[PDB]
Amino acid sequence: LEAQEMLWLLQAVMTPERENTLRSALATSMMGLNALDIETLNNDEHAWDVVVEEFDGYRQIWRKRGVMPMLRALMSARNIAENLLATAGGERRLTDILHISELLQEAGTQLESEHALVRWLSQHILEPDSNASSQQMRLESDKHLVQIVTIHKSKGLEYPLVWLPFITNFRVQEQAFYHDRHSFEAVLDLNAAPESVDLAEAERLAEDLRLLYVALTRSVWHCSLGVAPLVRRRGDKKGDTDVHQSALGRLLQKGEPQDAAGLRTCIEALCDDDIAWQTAQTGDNQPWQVNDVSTAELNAKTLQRLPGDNWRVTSYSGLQQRXXXXXXXXXXXXXXXXXXXXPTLTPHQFPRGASPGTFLHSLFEDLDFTQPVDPNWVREKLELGGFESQWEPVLTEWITAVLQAPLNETGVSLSQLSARNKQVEMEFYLPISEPLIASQLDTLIRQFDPLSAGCPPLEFMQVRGMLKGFIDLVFRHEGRYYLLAYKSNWLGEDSSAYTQQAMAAAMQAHRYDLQYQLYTLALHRYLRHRIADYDYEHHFGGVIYLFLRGVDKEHPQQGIYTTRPNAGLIALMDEMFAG
Amino acid sequence: VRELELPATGQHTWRFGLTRMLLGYAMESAQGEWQSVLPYDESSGLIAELVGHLASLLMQLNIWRRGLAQERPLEEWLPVCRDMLNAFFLPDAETEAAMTLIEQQWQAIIAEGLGAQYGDAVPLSLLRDELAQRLDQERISQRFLAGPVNICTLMPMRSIPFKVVCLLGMNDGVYPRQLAPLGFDLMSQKPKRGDRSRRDDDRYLFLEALISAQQKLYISYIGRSIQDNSERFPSVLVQELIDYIGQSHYLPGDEALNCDESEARVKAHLTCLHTRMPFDPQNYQPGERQSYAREWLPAASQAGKAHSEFVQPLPFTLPETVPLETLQRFWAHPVRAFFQMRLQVNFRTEDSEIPDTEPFILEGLSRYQINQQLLNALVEQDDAERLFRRFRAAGDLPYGAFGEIFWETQCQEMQQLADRVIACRQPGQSMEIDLACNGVQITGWLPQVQPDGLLRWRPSLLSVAQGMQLWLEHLVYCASGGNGESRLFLRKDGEWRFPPLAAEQALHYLSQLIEGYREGMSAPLLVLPESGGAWLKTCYDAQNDAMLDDDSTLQKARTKFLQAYEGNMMVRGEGDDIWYQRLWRQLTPETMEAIVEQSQRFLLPLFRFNQ
Amino acid sequence: KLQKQLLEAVEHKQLRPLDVQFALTVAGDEHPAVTLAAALLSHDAGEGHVCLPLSRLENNEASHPLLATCVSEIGELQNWEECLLASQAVSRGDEPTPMILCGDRLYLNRMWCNERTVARFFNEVNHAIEVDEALLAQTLDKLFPVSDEINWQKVAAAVALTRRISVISGGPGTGKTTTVAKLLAALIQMADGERCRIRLAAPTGKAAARLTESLGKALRQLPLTDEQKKRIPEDASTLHRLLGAQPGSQRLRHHAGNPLHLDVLVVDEASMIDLPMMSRLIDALPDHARVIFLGDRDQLASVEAGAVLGDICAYANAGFTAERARQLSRLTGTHVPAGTGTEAASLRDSLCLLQKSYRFGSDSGIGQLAAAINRGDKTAVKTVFQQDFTDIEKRLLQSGEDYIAMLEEALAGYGRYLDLLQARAEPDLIIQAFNEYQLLCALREGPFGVAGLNERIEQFMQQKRKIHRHPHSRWYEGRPVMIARNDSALGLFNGDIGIALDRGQGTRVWFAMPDGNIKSVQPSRLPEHETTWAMTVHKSQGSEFDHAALILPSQRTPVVTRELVYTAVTRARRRLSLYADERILSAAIATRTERRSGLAALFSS
Amino acid sequence: FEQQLIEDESLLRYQACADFWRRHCYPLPREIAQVVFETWKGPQALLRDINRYLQGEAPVIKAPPPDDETLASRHAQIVARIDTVKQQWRDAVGELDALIESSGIDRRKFNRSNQAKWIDKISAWAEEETNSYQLPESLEKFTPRHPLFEAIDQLLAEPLSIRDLVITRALAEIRETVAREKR
DNA sequence: TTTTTTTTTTTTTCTAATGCGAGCACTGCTAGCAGTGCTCGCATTAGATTT
């Protein structure tokens, strides 16, 4: 029944809004509420609202932390885990509850839904099966227990004191199945002809003997066993006692039918100094005398120091995060305007998500800049990507527009870059030593940064640790390095919605500002490391955000964006991350 | 159906069901069968839209199961996965990541095939079970060294110096891990130096982790199966380790004892046996090992108070007007009432799962409903054949011959009962009832009052609860005019017949009932309409109109009581019900008496006037 | 076959998938005329038409050249009655057949049975009840003070007292409910010694509550003894609860076997009664029961398939039977006009139409405009144009730069409310304030719709400081919400509004009961809720706002119709505003909602 | 090389039993079906009867029915086996040649009315209890009569059933089918 | 392309065995009758594994 109660609870916490499906869960013996409790609790609205509330917090624990944490919280608050142990026998019940919970984990992970779990539990309430893990655990190992066990499960075991209460009993086999004495082959007679029935019932009896043997050899010191004038045939008073058909009876009577008196005598005959027989006399005094237990004072220790401080390895993505409060930070703009005004080979139409972008990037990852584009190569990329041929002629053109676009003031063409000057997809780890506080930074940002005037100060919790990132591309031109990052996005637009203004707008919207500054710090330290006699101002060329969709043969500016870190911002920033 | 070589039936197939649904949309079920399909009434409205959507699913499910059957060369399998994904699925912000992985993996498999130049047609069951292996092959190690305490499996060639290394599940046979060599491998026959074999890998790892921990090593294994208290064992490695410790060290207590004795002594000191349950108070006894969980503390201290007896008296005030349906609904199961009626708790068991097969035989409420319809047809002396066709078309009966057989044993039982019903039946008109009983106005309706009296018939077994029902419904009838008898006929020729009664005794017994009713809403009155009925069957003697006393029978009524309470291994006993579970988990001989006393109070006038 | 043909109309979205699948199963393998014909039957029946007169399907031939489809083999099958009625998927009503062909109108078996039940119930079943005309006339005279002019209401009471089944039609605020109270009073006071069992039913629990309070307050006014005040009905219920519809099944605890036990039954707002519920009702009535329906002839029709009250009141235009006019002239003590000619005596006599609206007259632009709705658009552009009436205004919405301005006026529409929240007031006056102004949009979703306007308006609350919002909580103070489905526990019904606010005890929603009491419900407690800044026209039925604002989308959609706009117009108590294109609106008014049923034919034969 | 184990073999097994009882029972005409019905209602019970024999090594069946015999064959056989006794008892009826004895109670002749009545159709599978009276082993204990009087003993010597054949066919089939589906 | 309602209960095994009760034929004892031996039939009671 405890599985059922669990159902009522989970089912309630799932939708506490419903008056009935909650109250049902409250009435459960598990909750341990009187009739007076439920009665009053049906009257005062405040209390009822409090209950509804607590379950509503439980749903929260349920969604965030999983299941077992919830049921834990419920058990603590309701005090049930204690009140059961107070109650007599409730120890067993409590074991069942814990066990069920432990299973709700094992099935809880594999199923993603909160709701499909309540789906699952019912289905198991219907069909219990046989299976091993869902089989009941032993109730308590604290107290020594009576280990009540079937014969077959006693084989090869040892039991210092042994009881065979019902041993007299027998079952006359009506089914006819036996072994031929000659061929020794298992033979079934589908026909009831009495011979084969006999040939089998002899077997049933001999087997019963072997049961008796095994049962008697189990004991070490003492074994007791019951004996009765059992009567199978339904006639009351005869002088027929069928005990000779019992395994044991045949051994006492030497396979001879007797009366109950003869039974008693044949018992009395062998009884010397080992076997000793007493008449079976029902009696009841007291269940048993526990005399109870004494324990102690006891307490739980409690941690003093914090469990641990903040050390985290994060990317810039672990910085924007989300904002709890008046301002929430999202890439997209909440405000929307409706439009009431009323060739498919375009870049804006390309699919969107992490998946499409990862494809777009992965092109340029192996892609060769100095050679023009091979449409076959395209088709076999899209084919690998799973993208149809609807793309290949649409792509192979566009890419060339990308590779051919001149950049910055130097006017560099991506095409002009030799693989000696390319570095593709640099992963870096940048340590941040003392905790990095937002406001202690964004002032340094805003101070030297025109772009950081936009939007509030970035907010991220105190962090100390490592920082990760992938430079899309790094290359040197005219002995002067550059930093290149691809961005795609923009579901809504195709045309000049990418300008000098709107690019700088979106940069401030997705906070790519802090991002490029951080990379520049990384690339800076990496050059300072690698290049003997490195200087920021001499060797460094600025930062380039390239919006892939942004590239258009018509406008050289659209889609490309370049800014230089002040060299006065990095000077102080690097120091900040050092200490 | 015929594809699996099972005889074509024409029922219980998604075609049968759908056709039954649509036809349920066009025409009401009461009109009748059409092609020998019974229209399914439930979707008659705009809701029925869903059906068309459903039926559009299955068509696809049908089409594709044909398209996938034949083997194909690979480049014939290339386009499939796309048609199927975009066919059955509408991608979303979450899913597109997944679906792209499906296409990517699938087409990766096939591409592996083509690039290898493999011509022959391929069965689908080859690829379906490749792709299953391909989709779960991936692992996510991303967060490894992020800094949150690290949980992870033992991986070869990954050894990172740590201050604290924990090892779990060292039970023997779980670790090291075993994958045998293929068995036709030649390498495993004659090894050279640099061969790698999984077992030696694990055995070496357990050494790495030892060398790596710079302060605290922590090793754990399950000693005893929690479930059966069986024995379990440590892995052989842990065994060797504890051996080496115990042989290399001695506790400072005994500096001269013995090699082996100091050994088992130490090995006892290093091994901790944690308890079976968290609330075991040993955990919290102040000392070295003490648990930080404060949530189980009051449990271990055993400081909680036991659950009080569920029943507490509650105040109640009987209104002036009690709708007779309220009384009826009460006396059917007087315990269940006080939970649903009074304090509004009702335990709704989960609905039954869809059965997995066309009905072979009818049992339970399934066949009960059929007996109800069938009987109500025979009593009207309407033809049972028509209704038979109705069920057959409804797909409700076993197929074909057995439909006819089962149908014509049932017609033969319900015919027997049917006649006995028809014998006394005089058509009659319903009557409305208003009464003053103990200053309480009862209003209600009794359907079909014939001049002779109350006639009711149910295709059930003779049981008391039915009796109580006819008793209430009778006394209210005598209570307002209505001279005549009251009779009830049941299966295996059961009958309840109550002689007419004068308005005096009528109102007096009805008083006793109502008083029962206000008794109920206050305390969960314990009257078991069957088990108590069984106990009162033995004791009462109709010839003397007095319940017997002598203790010989009083151990008959107890055995016949418990026998009725808890059931056989065949029939479920009255004693097993959720409503009686909430009151007591186990029947005390005291509570037995408590039931016998009240049951003796209300039930007796039943058997006293039954004839 | 033509199957794959029908696979196209789904891409064309001219056929619901249900339609196609149905035609496939039932139509079977027959001549494609059968298959297509059936699919069209399921389609028109899906949009809510009861029948499919063969004229339309043979004349259009839009889905296929029904020459080749209709002319198959076996000589001339081209007769649609011939080809169709040949197959077993169609019959004359003799066999248990999916489809019925009766009056040239092919249509579903279910619709044909329910259809017939309705018909026979309105024609033959209802009877003439006879009483003293002098005494009855005196009772009415004490009910209605003014004898000097023809009173429509007094006619209505007289009619409903004479005829067993009777309907009373009229616009909103034309005084229906009061009239019903007058009737019921005449009923109780009419039969002194006989048991008079009154029952009050409404198709929606919300409207049921409105009726409870309405007839409570209205019946309390008129003098009655404690006996009559015992025979005053207690409460009104849902139509379903009355029939006791089981939640899962289609079973009914009444139907034909159990007549529900009544004397008279009053179903308010009968416009929402659809055909299936109408028939399933009719089966529950006894032969002594007097039933009365309430609703506007032009009110927006019921959602599920049919139009009952519309097809019925359409015959009111003819007027009373010649003699019945003289009878009522004796009854009301007036001259009752007589409709010329003979069409159906029993039906024409049962219908009364209330043409006087005490709420506002012809000088008010709402009654003139609403009265101009039933006519052509050249009257409506006129009215909206000339004089402005001060009660009606139209704002052109074409470019979104107009839409922003619409929202701009929406602010001041909510102004008093918004301030009363900023002023930090008590809940009652706030709730009463929220009912002065309301936005009504036809569609649910998109740029113009309840779902879109909630977003855009709240965003427009974030642009201009009015009410602050927290994204994480989702329950910022001041947001009005409404209930999705009825609830027995909290005593609040679907279609009801409440205001989310923090009194300082906590964030709590406040509802106004029909009893004037205010009940605060925890957010967790609420069953279902939807942000209520904008209502669909449908859900707004029965409500009254002092200033309403209608919003019609730019496109042309089958939802936007005449009756929709009509209800929107009658919705405002006094003030009204419109946002529409003169072309979209002006064409919308010209297109009347028709749902084809044989009723028009049935009552004439 | 990779075997996926399954510990629930009762569901596959039951599945197969329903498959058998579908293909070998649904085709039955009314009259044979009537006989199948008595011995078990439906495969739910049949499975319960043969279940210990489906598992583990297949037993050997003593004196199995020939492989080619169907249900209709066995049934027609038993039809005629009873039919001969039906005609015969109808022919020898109406005569007391027996030596009348007390313990054999004179109303035993009323039994004969039953039998001459009981002989109408073959549709029943159950011969009447009164037939036990006409056994020469029965009566001679209390008058050899004529042969058919002894033929009833031959008729009642071997119980008349379809059981063995169905348990045989089903036991051989369900075993295979399971093995195949698991393959 | 729009949308409304409503709350809950039901049943339960089959086969077989005996104990007695009722009715009858005979046979022996004192032609009929009482008893006994007998025999069938109706209701009631009991029991249905093992990894």
Give C308-327 as a DSSP string.
Answer: SHHHHHGGGGG-S-HHHHHH
Taking the C-alpha atoms of residue D133 and residue B10, their distance in angstroms, rounded to an integer, is 49
Closest CA to C581 of C445, C444, C398, C370: C398
Q: Does residue D103 reach within 7 angstroms of strand E, measured from its CB?
A: yes
What 3-state class would DSSP assign to B302?
A: coil
- Quick one: C407 and C325 in the same domain? no
Tell whether C598 is covered by a domain: no
Q: Say if C599 falls within a structural domain.
A: no
Is there a single domain that holds both residue C277 and residue C371?
no
Give C132: exposed, middle or buried? Use CB within 10 Å, 0-12, 13-18, 19+. exposed
Residue C494 CA to residue C210 CA, distance in Å, equals: 13
Q: In sequence order, which residues have a C-beta less than 8 Å from that of residue B69 and are 6 or more positions away?
A: none
Residue with tokens 């092109």: A363
Could you tell me if C187 and C156 lie in one domain? yes
Task: Give the phi and the psi of residue D15 in degrees, each rounded to 5.
Answer: -50, -55
Question: Are the beta carbons of A328 and C472 separated by less than 8 Å?
Answer: yes
- The residue type at A335: X
Query: What is the domain-level CATH number for residue C2?
Result: 1.10.10.1020
Distance from CA of D168 to the nearest CA of B (A): 20
**B8: buried, middle or exposed (CB in 10 Å: 19+, 13-18, 0-12)?**
exposed
- Annotate A166-207 with DSSP letters as a single string: TTT------S-EEE-TTT--EEE-SS--HHHHHHHHHHHHHH
Among A42, A520, A19, CA closest to C487: A19
Q: Do chains B and D touch (3 or more CB pairs under 8 A)?
A: yes
Residues C140, C268 within the same domain: yes
C396 and C521 inside one domain: yes
In A, minimum Cα distance to B314 occurs at A36
Helix-, strand-, coil-residue percentages of chain A, each rounded to 5: 45, 15, 45
Quote the CA–CA distance of C497 and A525 in Å, as a whole number. Answer: 62
CA–CA dist C83, B420 (Å, integer) = 53
C485 inside 8 A of chain A by CB: no
Query: Which residue matches tokens 């043979």?
Result: C58
Task: Name A56's Cβ contacts closer than 8 Å, sequence gap at least 6.
Answer: A16, C524
C-alpha to C-alpha distance for A168 and C314, rounded to whole angstroms: 91
With the CA atoms of A502, A508, A512 and A518 taken in that order, what torsion angle do they form, in degrees rounded to the nearest 10? 130
d(CA B20, CA B34): 10
| Minimum distance, in Å, between the CA of residue D94 and any CA atom of chain A | 35
Spatial separation of the C-alpha atoms in residues A321 and C279, rounded to whole Å? 60
**In terms of C-beta distances under 8 Å and separation of at least 24 residues, what long-range contacts does C27-30 make, across chains too?**
C27/C87, C27/C89, C28/C87, C28/C89, C29/C1, C30/C87, C30/C89
3-state secondary structure at position C94: coil
Q: C526: how many CB neighbours lie within 10 A of its CB?
A: 20
Q: Are residues C394 and C508 in the same domain?
A: yes
CA angle A470, A473, A479 (to 5 degrees): 130
Q: Which structural technique was applied?
A: cryo-EM
H helical segments located in B142-258? 198-212, 236-248
Handedness of CA B389, B394, B400, B406 (dihedral sign): negative
> What would the 3-class secondary structure string for C196-226 be?
CCEEEEECCHHHHHHHHHHHHHHHHHCCCCH
The residue numbers preceding gaps of C to N over 2.5 A in chain A are: 342
Chain A residues at the C interface, defined by Cβ less than 8 Å, are 16-19, 49, 52-53, 56, 324-326, 328, 334-342
Smallest Cα distance from B84 to chain A, Å: 13
**Residue C605 placed within a domain:** no
State how far the Cα of B354 lies from the Cα of B30, in Å rounded to an integer.
25
* Same domain (yes/no): C60, C154: no
Q: Per the structure block, which two tokens stand in for C423?
A: 């002023």
- Report yes or no: C580 and C549 within 8 Å, Cβ to Cβ: no
Q: Name the phi and psi angles at C518, rounded to 5.
A: -110, 125
**Residue type at position A448:** F
Look at the alpha carbons of C347, C350, C356, C360 in this order and tell me if their dihedral is positive or negative: negative
In a domain, D2, yes or no: no
Q: Cβ(D82)–Cβ(D160) under 8 Å?
A: yes
Query: What is d(CA D37, CA D71) in angstroms, rounded to the nearest whole number?
Result: 13
Closest partner residue to A42 (CB to CB) among B228, B312, B344 is: B344
Contact between A6 and A97 (Cβ < 8 Å): yes
Q: From chain A, pick out residues whose CB is under 8 angstroms from the CB of B348.
A: 20-21, 24
Q: What is the CA radius of gyration of chain B?
A: 38
Count the helix, strand and coil residues of chain B and give each as a percent rounded to the nearest 5: 45, 10, 45
Q: Do C86 and C219 fall into the same domain?
A: no
Positions in chain E where some atom is under 7 Å from a protein CB: 1-13, 17-19, 23-27, 37-41, 46-51
Specify whether the CB–CB gap between B609 and B466 falls below 8 A: no
Q: Are A166 and A228 in contact (CB under 8 A)?
A: no
- What is chain A's alpha carbon radius of gyration, rounded to the nearest angstrom? 42
* For chain C, the helix, strand and coil percentages under 3-state DSSP, each to the nearest 5: 45, 15, 40
Q: Do D17 and B388 contact (CB within 8 A), yes or no? A: no
DSSP secondary-structure letter at A108?
H
Domain of residue C18, residue span: 1-108
Q: Does C52 touch chain B (CB under 8 A)?
A: no
Residue C548 falls inside a structural domain: yes
Beta carbons within 8 Å of A80's beta carbon, 6+ residues apart: A30, A31, A32, A74
Which residue from A49, A325, A338 is facing C403, i.e. has the nearest CB?
A338
Contact of A369 with A414, CB cutoff 8 Å:
yes
Residue written as token pair 């699938």: B106
In 3-state terms, what secondary structure has residue B30? coil
Look up residue C309 and give its two tokens.
Answer: 């009250």
CB contact under 8 A, C524 and A52: yes
Strand E-proximal residues of A, range 144-183, CB below 7 A, are 150, 152-153, 171, 173
Q: What is the CATH number of the domain that holds D73?
A: 1.10.3170.10
- The alpha carbon of C28 is separated from its chain's Cα centroid by a whole number of angstroms, namely 38
DSSP state of B398: P
Nucleotide closest in space to B47 (CA vs C1'):
E3
C535 vs C529: CA distance, rounded Å: 13
Count CB neighbours of C228 within 10 A.
16
**Partners of chain A (3+ Cβ pairs below 8 A):** B, C, D
Distance CA C40, CA C5 (A): 13
What are the phi and psi torsion angles at C549 (to 5°)? Answer: -130, 120
Q: Are residues C425 and C467 in the same domain?
A: yes
Token digits of residue A337: 């305007």
Establish how many alpha carbons lie within 13 A of residue A513's alpha carbon, considering only the half-sphere containing its beta carbon.
25
CB contact under 8 A, A336 and C455: yes
A275 forms bridges with which residues in the sheet?
A: A273
Looking at the structure, tell me whether residues C347 and C368 fall in a common domain: no
Residue B350 and residue A7: Cβ atoms within 8 Å? yes
Residue D133 is classified by DSSP as: G
C264-267 and C290-295 beta bridge pairing: parallel
Residue D24 lies in a domain: yes
Within-domain flag for C601 = no
The number of domains in chain D is 1
Any chains having at least 3 CB pairs less than 8 A from chain B are: A, C, D
Q: Count of CB atoms within 10 A of residue A132's CB?
A: 8
Cα distances (Å, whole numbers) of residue C371 to B262, B563, C357, C366: 109, 79, 11, 8
Burial C416-429 (b: 16+ CB within 10 A, else e): ebbebbeeeeebee
Joined together, the tokens standing for residue D29 give 């005409």
C113 and C92 within one domain: no
Q: Which residues does chain B have within 8 Å of residue D177's beta carbon, measured at their own beta carbons?
A: none
Smallest CA-to-CA distance from C522 within C504, C509, C503 is with C509
Backbone angles phi, psi at C534, to 5 degrees: -125, 130
Residue A423: CB atoms within 10 A of its CB come to: 15
How distant is the Cα of A3 from the closest Cα of chain D, in angstroms?
23
Characterize the bridge pairing of strands A422-436 and A463-477. antiparallel
Q: What is the H or E stretch that residue A542 is in?
A: strand A540-547
* Range(s) of the domain holding residue D21: 8-183
- Is there a contact between A224 and A218 (Cβ–Cβ < 8 Å)? no
Is D32 contained in some domain?
A: yes
Give the C-alpha separation, D177 to B158, whole Å: 50
- C604: in domain: no
Q: State the Cα–Cα distance between residues B206 and C105, nearest whole angstrom.
A: 86
| A227 Cβ neighbours under 8 A, 6+ residues apart | A167, A168, A248, A252, A263, A267, A277
Check residue B144 and report its DSSP letter: T
Helix, strand or coil, per DSSP, at residue B592: helix
Resolution stated for this PDB structure, in Å = 3.8
- Residue with the two structure tokens 């009254």: C544
Residues 406-465 of B with CB under 7 A from strand E: 458-461, 463
Query: Which 8-state DSSP code applies to residue B281?
Result: G
| Cα torsion C114, C117, C119, C121: sign | negative
For chain A, positions 1-20, list CB contacts with chain B under 8 A: 1, 4, 7-8, 20
Phi and psi angles of residue B234, each rounded to the nearest 5 degrees, phi first: -80, 155
The owner of tokens 């939807």 is C530
> What does the CA dihedral A121, A124, A125, A131 come to, rounded to 10 degrees?
-130
Element (H, E) at B498: strand B494-498
Distance, in Å, from the CA atom of B333 to the CA atom of C55, rounded to the nearest integer, reads 62
Number of CB atoms found within 10 A of residue C141's CB: 13
* Residue D1 resides in a domain: no
> Cα–Cα distance between C98 and C93 in angstroms, integer?
10
B164 Cα distance to chain centroid: 46
Distance of CA A189 to the CA centre of its chain: 55
Rounded distance between C-alpha atoms, residue A561 and residue A499, angstroms:
9
Residue C487: helix, strand or coil by DSSP?
coil
Chains touching D (at least 3 CB pairs under 8 A) are A, B
> Which residue gives the smallest C-alpha to C1' distance to E5?
C240
Dihedral sign, CA of A239, A240, A246, A247? positive
Show the 3-state SS of C15-68.
CCHHHHHHHHHHHCCCCHHHHHHHHHHHHHHHCCCCCEEHHHHHHHCCCCCHHH
Query: Of C48, C82, C108, which residue is a domain's last?
Result: C108
Partners of C211 in the β-ladder: none
Token pair of A38 as six digits: 């439920």
Asked if residue A446 lies in contact with residue A454, where contact means CB atoms within 8 angstroms, the answer is no
Q: Which residues pair with B431 in a beta bridge?
A: B446
* Residue B219 bridge partners (DSSP): B167
**CA torsion through residues C87, C90, C95, C96, sign:** positive
Q: Which residues touch A355 (CB under 8 Å, ≥6 apart)? A: B96, B97, B100
Report DSSP state, residue A137.
P
Q: How far, in Å, are A4, A84, A412, B451, B564 from residue B306 at the CA level?
A: 21, 7, 83, 59, 31
For residues C347 and C165, is the Cβ–Cβ distance under 8 A? no
Closest residue in C to B446 (Cα) is C258
Residue A534 has what DSSP assignment? -
Q: Which of C304, C321, C354 is the last residue of a domain?
A: C354
Domain boundary among C46, C78, C108: C108
Instruction: Confirm if C271 and C302 have CB atoms less than 8 A apart.
Output: yes
Query: In the 8-state DSSP scheme, what is residue C333?
Result: I
Q: Which residue has the tokens 């090793």?
A: B219
Q: Does D34 sit within 8 Å of B405, measured CB to CB?
A: yes
Q: Which residue has the tokens 């492989």?
A: D67
Distance between first and last Cα of chain A:
62
CA angle D123, D128, D129 (to 5 degrees): 155
Query: How many domains does chain C fold into?
Result: 3
C600 located within any domain: no
Interface of B with C (CB under 8 A): 18-19, 22-23, 25-28, 31-34, 41-42, 44-46, 48-49, 51-53, 55-56, 59, 432, 445
Residues C541, C501 share a domain:
yes
Report which of A332, A441, A420, A315 is spatially closest to residue A369, judged by C-alpha positions: A420
Q: Is position C225 within any domain? A: yes
Type of residue numbered D15: Q
DSSP E strand stretches across C367-436: 394-395
